Amino acid sequence: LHHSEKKYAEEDQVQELLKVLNEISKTTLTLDPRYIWRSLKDLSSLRNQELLNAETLCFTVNVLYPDSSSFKKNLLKFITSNHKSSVPGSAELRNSYPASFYSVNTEKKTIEVTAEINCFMHLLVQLFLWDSKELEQLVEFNRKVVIPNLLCYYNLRSLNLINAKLWFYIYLSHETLARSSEEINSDNQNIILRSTMMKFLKIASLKHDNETKAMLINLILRDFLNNGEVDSASDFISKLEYPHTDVSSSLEARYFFYLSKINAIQLDYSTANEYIIAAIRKAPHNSKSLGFLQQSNKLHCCIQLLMGDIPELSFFHQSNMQKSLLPYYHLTKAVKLGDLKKFTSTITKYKQLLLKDDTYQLCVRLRSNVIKTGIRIISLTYKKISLRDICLKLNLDSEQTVEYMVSRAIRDGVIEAKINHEDGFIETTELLNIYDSEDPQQVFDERIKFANQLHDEYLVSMRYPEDKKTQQNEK
Amino acid sequence: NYEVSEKAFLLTQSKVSIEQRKEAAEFVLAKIKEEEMAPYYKYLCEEYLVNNGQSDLEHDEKSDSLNEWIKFDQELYNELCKKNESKIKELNEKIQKLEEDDEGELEQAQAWINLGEYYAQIGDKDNAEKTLGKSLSKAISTGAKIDVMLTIARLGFFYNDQLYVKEKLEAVNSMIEKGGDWERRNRYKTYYGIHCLAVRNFKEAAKLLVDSLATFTSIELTSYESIATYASVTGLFTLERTDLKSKVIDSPELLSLISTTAALQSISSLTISLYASDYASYFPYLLETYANVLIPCKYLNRHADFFVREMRRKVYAQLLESYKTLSLKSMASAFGVSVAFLDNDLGKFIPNKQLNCVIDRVNGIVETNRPDNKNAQYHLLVKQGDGLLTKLQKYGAAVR
């Protein structure tokens, strides 16, 4: 029973291992194993539940263990190990074959097979930790191991793609430990975590690995948003080390999402409005990306309201996620009509729900835009309106107060009007008739480069896959 | 079945006259004696509440209503069992002999169709479609296909289903496409235009209503005089003033509708007054259109105020084309509107970007906003570039 369960999963694990083993030996095929490693994460997670945990025990006995004998016992110690044929050396699949890691040449240390075996061993360990939700001592113990090992080994083009996915588990397992319980050991552990990311990021800079630098930047930018340091986030994004070529669309959407929150506090909403739109287009529409689409769609509504523009109501209607978008709908109506008591009671009841995503702190800045939008509505309907006529609409304090809210408006060129005090009314300065000026021609020249921007990323990408057609033989 | 649903709809909300519910009570009381309305009769209390819906002698015991004839009694209770016997129990023994003896095909299929129509008045939609499926396999020509589109349509008009009716009608017409004459094709197209009232498609509701003939009468689904109100109100709502002259105000079928029934007051009062540029008498015409048409009709209540608002903004835009600058003593004096209330009309219309106009406070001079050299070659010309760029880069960025 238990014997047939251990040998079945190990054969499938070696079968997937031999596919990426022969591809890294000859020249550089490394682009190919990257596609296999995408499905390796999903196929291993479903396989971990079946045939219990014993698939990883016989795999370590098969190959040579540099560090991995005591790590399995420590991993099995927390789960109250059940010992069945647990003596090392019970299962031997090598049987002296070249693709099986021939034992005599391996045990005599005349050849080194540890490079691809050890780096692959740490990957399967991190998969079971996230599946079994093992925390506390097992989180810190594995962090003290993998990091010094990566500094000792010299990573090639294919080796840099191994640990590229391991850095995500280091930051993920560290944040789940802090949110579960707060302790002095968690704050000091985060200090080493921050200094470690910057040391390896410099290593990947010389190797110019696309997937490695894409995973690190996404983890580093998130650490800046938690601490809220402006000087660290602004200086990091000025280097522009993020490759846009071979990185996945899921890694791209996460990058544009960080730039929207950073530029939101910089009081420049022109660039931040484009970054939140590009993050939606790059993110897939499947169910696994709904977690990113849920947070990104909530940030888009906050960026629009801070620009003075009001987002469409169909976004809160035709979508299927509007159940969580209900708090933002009442904020939309309160800004339009400019009601004083409507916004106060709106943010009071939902104060608890908006605290989770930290979007309630941005609602304080939304209060200023409540009247600023109402001023734009009354200014477009009335070209010349008396000073006392505005206070009768929005029920403001006094005519002395409303005069200075239009002040903050046209400083940046929002309303584009003038206040005549002697005449006693506010007149709109826009005469339209701007088609004959050269101001539209400035934007017109940008649309030519936008269509030309699609050339170099396209015409060059035709022959890119085509080199395999002429080299391979055809019927 | 539509004659009851139209009259009993006045029992929901009436802010004008109580006699509207009293005159409609004579139609409801007369039909429940001949046929059993129990699925719709009980649905009146389960549709709207806290007006006439609280009064019941069976499900929930309360009295709130202006009419006491909506409560169950011993007469309708005995008639409920009579419909389950004569229409069901008596026919179930006759249809069972035809299935075992295997006599005919189309002759037996008509018995399943007539049986399925009995479940519509009883309120069972499971056996109505079940008996229809058995007759669908025996149906070949279009003689038995005409009753298939009604069975799904009875869910929308009678059972009040705005969701599963549209999906099923598109599947039946796509599997077997015949259409018969134009009146058979209207039965599909009429619901498509009416369904736009629930999802609020605005001018897209009258697309298939205007092309439909005025002689269309579905009886139990809809009547002859009521269907004339849907095409008259939505027709002017969709077609612009230029299309009103060569289509609406002059039509062979439409002009015969208002001559027979005076309850429309749409294709005539709202048109002739607009052709004469008279907005003073044009204002009270919206009263009979809202009160005597939109309110008594069921599907026209989904929008209500949404109708007359866009009709006013449309006729106010035509006045802006006849003069560059208007006066305060023109719009706000002779037409009957007041400075405070008229300013609220266009007050919310301008920021919606639906109509561009300038309203003055002190001097009261309404100026017409025109794009001049901008027109459609400024904002609309560059909008198509980035508007299509999203759909163009959809399959380009993600490949397959």
Binding site: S314, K336 | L286, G336, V337, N344
Partner: peptide, 27 residues
């Protein structure tokens, strides 16, 4: 799709529309 569907207006129903008939005779 902006300022259209659910927000609506909540005015121009009866009282405001019925008042405009009396203004014609007051001129």
């Amino acid at each position: 799709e902006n300022w259209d569907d659910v927000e609506v207006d909540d005015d121009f129903t009866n009282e405001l529309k019925a008042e405009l008939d009396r203004y014609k005779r007051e001129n």
